[PDB]
């Protein structure tokens, strides 16, 4: 699988549980939220591609998804109880824990760098032709 493909299921399933109607609408989206979380935990983030399995950040990645399944684990057994309130009210910390693993400025100053080299080479070539061409 892929990290951000699991966040393609984890983002849109996170915003549906907040104001939802019945207890299965909590419970079906929580089964999407748990099962994509363990598959992302096996993965590797792309900015830490070249390291070891036993790196200090990669454990700090891999215990950093134990917190998120553990903060899935708060709203699991309340969702057996039929509480429409206590499921979504305990699940408000999921957006804070997406913020703590956002793991990107040094790559994006190649992308804005490369498009100007294919913009200024248009202007520098067509500008000289824009001067000299009616005398010749």
């Amino acid at each position: 699988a892929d990290l951000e493909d699991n966040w393609e299921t984890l983002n849109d399933n996170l915003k549906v549980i907040e104001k939802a109607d019945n207890a299965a609408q909590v419970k079906d989206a929580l089964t999407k939220m748990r099962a994509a979380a363990l598959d992302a935990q096996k993965a590797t983030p792309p900015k830490l591609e070249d390291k070891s399995p036993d790196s200090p950040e990669m454990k700090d990645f891999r215990h950093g998804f134990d917190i998120l399944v553990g903060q899935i684990d708060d709203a699991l057994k309340l969702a057996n109880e039929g509480k429409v309130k206590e499921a979504q009210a305990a699940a408000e910390q999921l957006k804070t824990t997406r913020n703590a693993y956002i793991q990107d400025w040094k790559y994006v100053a190649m992308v804005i760098d490369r498009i100007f080299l294919w913009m200024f080479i248009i202007v520098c070539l067509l500008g000289t032709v824009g001067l000299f061409l009616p005398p010749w």
Partner: antibody, heavy 120, light 107 residues
Framework: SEVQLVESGGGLVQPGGSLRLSCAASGFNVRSFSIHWVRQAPGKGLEWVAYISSSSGSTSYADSVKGRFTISADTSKNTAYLQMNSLRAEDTAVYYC?????????????????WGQGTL | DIQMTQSPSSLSASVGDRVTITCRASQSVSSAVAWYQQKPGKAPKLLIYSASSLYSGVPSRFSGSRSGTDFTLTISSLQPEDFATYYCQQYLYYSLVTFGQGTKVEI
């Protein structure tokens, strides 16, 4: 040195009635382990009944047994007590008690593996 | 729920031969498949936990394989001491645990 789990209490329920099942877990603790209960209707595959999480007392019943089943446990002598009210003959099954470890860790990935001798 | 489609329910194949057992889950389970050998009437035993890994005390002629939704128990040298009612089983969350219907080889 081994973890062992002993299933007992098997017999007849009078029709309409109730009965309590006992699982005695010898060798290990129950306060850091969820204990599940799983039956096998005969001539078939497998079909899960209910569970109890003894870290907080909490239990989950299936849609077969909601309203009719009630589990508790004693943490002193490592025992599980399952309460069966208003049964049927599709409950006439092989009953096993079961172990599961907790998140995080490799013992979460360790599934059901200590399966007992079974009661009818 | 998350149903579990066994294939096959029963089979009949030779001594020593390579036998495949496939199972397809009905929605996304990450890595949680456990496979079980079920002998006639005794205590059941676990062969495969985490969908491809051997149990600590199971022979290494058996193995498992996940590939997305496909979960497959492979038997290389199926000995005469090995016939059963086999089980794929999910273990995602404690209240939604479903089994397989079983795979019944006899020797």
């Amino acid at each position: 040195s081994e973890v062992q789990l002993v299933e007992s209490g098997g017999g007849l329920v009078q029709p309409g009635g109730s009965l309590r099942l006992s699982c005695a877990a010898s060798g290990f603790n129950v306060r850091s382990f969820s204990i599940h209960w799983v039956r096998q209707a005969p001539g078939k595959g497998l079909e899960w009944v209910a569970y109890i999480s003894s870290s907080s007392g909490s239990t989950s019943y299936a849609d077969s047994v909601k309203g009719r089943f009630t589990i508790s446990a004693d943490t002193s002598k490592n025992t599980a007590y399952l309460q069966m009210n208003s049964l049927r003959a599709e409950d006439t099954a092989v009953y096993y008690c079961a172990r599961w470890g907790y998140w995080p860790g490799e013992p979460w990935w360790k599934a059901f593996d200590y399966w007992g001798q079974g009661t009818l | 729920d998350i149903q579990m489609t066994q294939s096959p329910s029963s089979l009949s194949a030779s001594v020593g031969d390579r036998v495949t057992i496939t199972c397809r889950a009905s929605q996304s389970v990450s890595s949680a498949v456990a496979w079980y050998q079920q002998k006639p009437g005794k205590a059941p035993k676990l062969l495969i936990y985490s969908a491809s890994s051997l149990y600590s005390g199971v022979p290494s002629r058996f193995s498992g394989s996940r590939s997305g939704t496909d979960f497959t128990l492979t038997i290389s040298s199926l000995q005469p001491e090995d016939f059963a009612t086999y089980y794929c089983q999910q273990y995602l969350y404690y209240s939604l645990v479903t089994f397989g219907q079983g795979t019944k080889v006899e020797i």
